[PDB]
Amino acid sequence: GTVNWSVEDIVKGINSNNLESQLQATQAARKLLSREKQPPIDNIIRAGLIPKFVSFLGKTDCSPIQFESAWALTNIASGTSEQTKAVVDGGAIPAFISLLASPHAHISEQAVWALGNIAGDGSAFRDLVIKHGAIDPLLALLAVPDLSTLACGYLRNLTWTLSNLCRNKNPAPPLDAVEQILPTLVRLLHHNDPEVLADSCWAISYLTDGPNERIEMVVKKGVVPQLVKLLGATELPIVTPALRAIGNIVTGTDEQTQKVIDAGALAVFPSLLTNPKTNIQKEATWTMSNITAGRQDQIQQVVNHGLVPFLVGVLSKADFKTQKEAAWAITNYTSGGTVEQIVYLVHCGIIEPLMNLLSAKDTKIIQVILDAISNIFQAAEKLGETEKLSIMIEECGGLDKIEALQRHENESVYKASLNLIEKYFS
């Protein structure tokens, strides 16, 4: 019937003066654009069909052609930026926003999806969707006493589209749009559907990826406990955005960071720092490095939760990028920590794996490790045990590594190594 039409036949049907012929041709276009292999998006664009599809969005008396054209345009807009731009350039944004209020749920849903693809292109189209007024009608679809009364797929698409309105930087979404969206988003973050939770978490991760004022807007809504609960979820697609969001929040102020600690986040990090997914381990170690850059009482809570042995483990064995985050966590710890916290780090076995990382062909980590070594030596100096540390570094083969760093191709690396071997190993 409408399966596997040629673009030429689609054009012929859409150019008829016959709404039903246009309907079958639009469905045939939709099916072409919905096939799994290589949808002919560019051929459909070059055929000049986008303006007609956009006009079909307005045919209230033929809801089927509204649906079919919304779907066709959704999938054109799923393509490259040039292809999305063709849909926008055809006037699709206001037509899709008007379909959000359609009495037909499948049509409103298709318009939700289309606007998500447009917004997902990047900041400009995101902001253009916002300027055309998409937020009010989108949130009105979710203004129900219980989200569970909405169709699962409808709710997931609404959540994914809202997430794209939260996504991307340079610029971040308009502050007023974020504030308008957040109460609904927090409600989605408590919904029981794993895909809704994942995309809600992603939205929160995007909103917290920025200056402390953006972080504060989110934290003020009280989402941190729910993020920490989701941080302990079994579904990796939920842990990943929940961890990203928690990680973003701890890049903010000590108060914002303390909110994460008080919600119980640190109790989940034994699992996160040993998580078999490398990206989780990395992001968790990155989050830890930003926590160990906090207050001494925050470092202390890291100690109290038993996480220093987990940092020693990551430093001892992990993907190199995770190990680099762990090196940063140690340098931050030793720069801000008390002497008692720093010695505790040594008793946990940090020296050997830290020295072993000096044999890496990466200059940044080398400088980070040398800074940590210096901080630990300064702590030992304050205790008079400087020599004992020197021995330990020598026994593990570290002295040789620092001596070799003298002959490195970086000034700070050479100068740092020379200063250590002169101040402590002479």
């Binding site: 654009l33 919905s34 799994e36 949808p39 779907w71 959704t74 999938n75 807009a77 799923s78 393509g79 999305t84 298709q110 999806w113 998500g116 693809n117 997902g120 292109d121 994914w160 794209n164 996504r167 990826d209 990680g247 973003n248 701890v250 890049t251 903010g252 990155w286 490095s289 930003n290 850059a293 940063w328 340098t331 931050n332 720069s335 801000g336």
Partner: peptide, 17 residues
């Protein structure tokens, strides 16, 4: 010292199958 930062294989945009 804080350091800041449905067809499948899809996150930014979604093609409806």
């Amino acid at each position: 010292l804080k350091r800041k930062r449905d067809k499948e294989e899809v996150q930014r945009k979604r093609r409806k199958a």
